[PDB]
Amino acid sequence: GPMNIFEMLRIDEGLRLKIYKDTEGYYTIGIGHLLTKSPSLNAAKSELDKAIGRNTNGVITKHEAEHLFNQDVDAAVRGILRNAKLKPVYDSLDAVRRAALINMVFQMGETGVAGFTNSLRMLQQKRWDEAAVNLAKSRWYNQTPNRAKRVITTFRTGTWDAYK
Amino acid sequence: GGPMNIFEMLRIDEGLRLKIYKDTEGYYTIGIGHLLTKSPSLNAAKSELDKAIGRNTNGVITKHEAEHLFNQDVDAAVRGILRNAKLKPVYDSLDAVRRAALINMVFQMGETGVAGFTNSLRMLQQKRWDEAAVNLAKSRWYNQTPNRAKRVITTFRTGTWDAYK
Ligand SMILES: [Cu+2]
Ligand SMILES: [Cu+2]
């Protein structure tokens, strides 16, 4: 089966069914669903219960995680469409590259992503190699080099060859 | 229980069938509206099916298998919009809810058939919802599957999920 944003994110975020800490040290679960930014497992546990609508004692099913994953991806796409900075960039991109973008928003959030002012212009102007270079200079690249490298290659090439 | 989206919307219009069936156009299909072949041969259908699933299905598949195809198919519809000179502009100008109605149209009829709605498409891009809603009702689409078209059109006119609630 050929790629999409779901498989892409499914690969970058992986699937975990116990509450774990993301690379930022924030508690999480499922496919990269942020529970809380607080360093409290107990705070994370309650936040999880609200999200799933039941008592989980830290554990959810595979279906439950896909349900969250769906809403979250959807939430990121809608976030981009309400962001004055991102929407134009998004609209100008081809399918593969819109996936790369949604990937960054999924991980970092809109605001964080809107901060890549220069790279964004390069993207909207189809200067693929220049943006790829500029994106590597970023804190984002340094904090998560492997995932960032993969995403950047997608921007540069417009192909799935970093995931295939 | 969370807010509607294209998947939920399509899951309702297509339903879930784990056995090969003929859709409304007559073509062999499976899962959540996954077209297998436009050919009258069940054997070509079964071949296509076993190819896609990568085993020998004996003409039957699991729900998870069917949702796997669902993902591929929805993405293909979106990709089909972004590939078409007439569809992309309309799509880009649409709000999230209305983009779904569009994706729904392409999922069912295909990129090319949907591009044929030149007038309705232009009205959508001009935000003449009610005019578009009416133009869309006079179409082969509406005649063949009026119940699904009503939902999709109501979504286009109002911009809300009230037709699926
Ligand atoms: Cu596949
Ligand atoms: Cu939900």
Side-chain angles (χ1 to χ4, degrees), chain A residues 1-163, chain B residues 1-164:
Chain A
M3 295 283 308
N4 46 76
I5 172 62
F6 302 101
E7 236 48 58
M8 193 189 189
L9 283 178
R10 186 175 318 268
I11 291 175
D12 291 334
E13 291 292 357
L15 169 65
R16 297 202 52 175
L17 309 181
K18 324 303 165 190
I19 301 173
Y20 66 98
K21 311 164 229 52
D22 72 346
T23 62
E24 287 278 45
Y26 307 136
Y27 289 113
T28 312
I29 200 174
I31 318 187
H33 178 107
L34 177 56
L35 295 168
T36 189
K37 282 194 185 183
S38 247
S40 171
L41 178 63
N42 281 336
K45 278 166 176 289
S46 50
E47 283 288 16
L48 175 54
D49 288 332
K50 174 190 282 197
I52 303 292
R54 69 173 176 85
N55 271 67
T56 71
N57 7 286
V59 178
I60 74 180
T61 79
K62 184 261 165 52
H63 178 94
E64 304 176 8
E66 292 292 311
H67 208 99
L68 283 177
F69 180 55
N70 258 101
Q71 247 87 355
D72 286 12
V73 170
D74 201 271
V77 179
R78 286 162 38 223
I80 306 176
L81 296 187
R82 301 263 257 9
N83 193 278
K85 187 76 142 293
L86 297 176
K87 178 163 187 290
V89 180
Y90 179 89
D91 291 346
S92 85
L93 282 179
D94 50 84
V96 172
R97 296 182 165 101
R98 345 241 278 193
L101 185 71
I102 306 179
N103 197 296
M104 291 182 64
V105 173
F106 190 93
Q107 169 185 15
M108 306 172 39
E110 295 175 54
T111 292
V113 183
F116 297 74
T117 314
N118 301 99
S119 295
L120 286 162
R121 185 206 321 103
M122 307 189 202
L123 285 181
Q124 186 158 18
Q125 287 178 356
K126 295 168 157 52
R127 301 172 119 189
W128 310 124
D129 306 88
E130 301 190 7
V133 175
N134 220 252
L135 284 163
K137 303 184 176 184
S138 75
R139 177 193 181 183
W140 170 63
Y141 189 99
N142 307 145
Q143 292 182 301
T144 36
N146 300 336
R147 177 170 174 178
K149 208 176 304 170
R150 227 174 292 125
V151 168
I152 297 170
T153 285
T154 323
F155 272 131
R156 173 193 325 132
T157 66
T159 70
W160 296 112
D161 298 341
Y163 293 87
Chain B
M4 282 272 299
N5 54 31
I6 182 70
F7 306 96
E8 225 42 70
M9 186 193 196
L10 275 177
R11 214 175 264 113
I12 289 155
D13 296 355
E14 298 287 3
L16 176 56
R17 283 173 273 197
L18 306 177
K19 184 188 208 64
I20 301 184
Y21 64 97
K22 296 176 172 176
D23 68 7
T24 143
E25 280 290 85
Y27 306 137
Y28 288 108
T29 304
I30 212 187
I32 310 172
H34 181 80
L35 170 73
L36 281 174
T37 184
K38 297 195 179 190
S39 160
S41 193
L42 181 63
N43 292 324
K46 290 183 166 174
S47 182
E48 281 294 317
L49 176 55
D50 290 355
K51 178 196 283 186
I53 307 301
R55 69 184 169 86
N56 302 137
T57 58
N58 183 37
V60 174
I61 67 169
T62 77
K63 178 173 138 53
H64 182 24
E65 281 170 3
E67 293 272 337
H68 200 85
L69 302 168
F70 190 47
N71 278 75
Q72 312 293 355
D73 289 345
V74 176
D75 189 55
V78 173
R79 195 197 341 301
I81 290 162
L82 279 346
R83 195 178 80 109
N84 186 282
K86 309 215 289 174
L87 295 170
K88 187 185 182 302
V90 174
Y91 183 78
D92 294 335
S93 79
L94 286 175
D95 59 276
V97 175
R98 293 187 173 94
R99 326 224 300 198
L102 185 53
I103 298 175
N104 192 312
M105 291 194 66
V106 179
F107 184 93
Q108 163 179 25
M109 313 176 68
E111 167 197 336
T112 243
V114 182
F117 300 71
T118 304
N119 302 121
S120 311
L121 280 171
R122 178 176 35 75
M123 299 185 191
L124 283 180
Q125 191 170 7
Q126 303 186 323
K127 300 175 133 55
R128 304 147 129 236
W129 313 125
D130 296 79
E131 314 192 49
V134 159
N135 206 244
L136 276 170
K138 321 166 188 168
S139 70
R140 182 169 167 85
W141 177 50
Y142 189 74
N143 287 120
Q144 311 303 130
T145 44
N147 293 324
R148 173 180 184 169
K150 275 177 184 181
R151 294 182 230 106
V152 179
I153 287 163
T154 291
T155 313
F156 269 140
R157 186 196 321 112
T158 69
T160 63
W161 300 105
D162 293 339
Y164 293 91

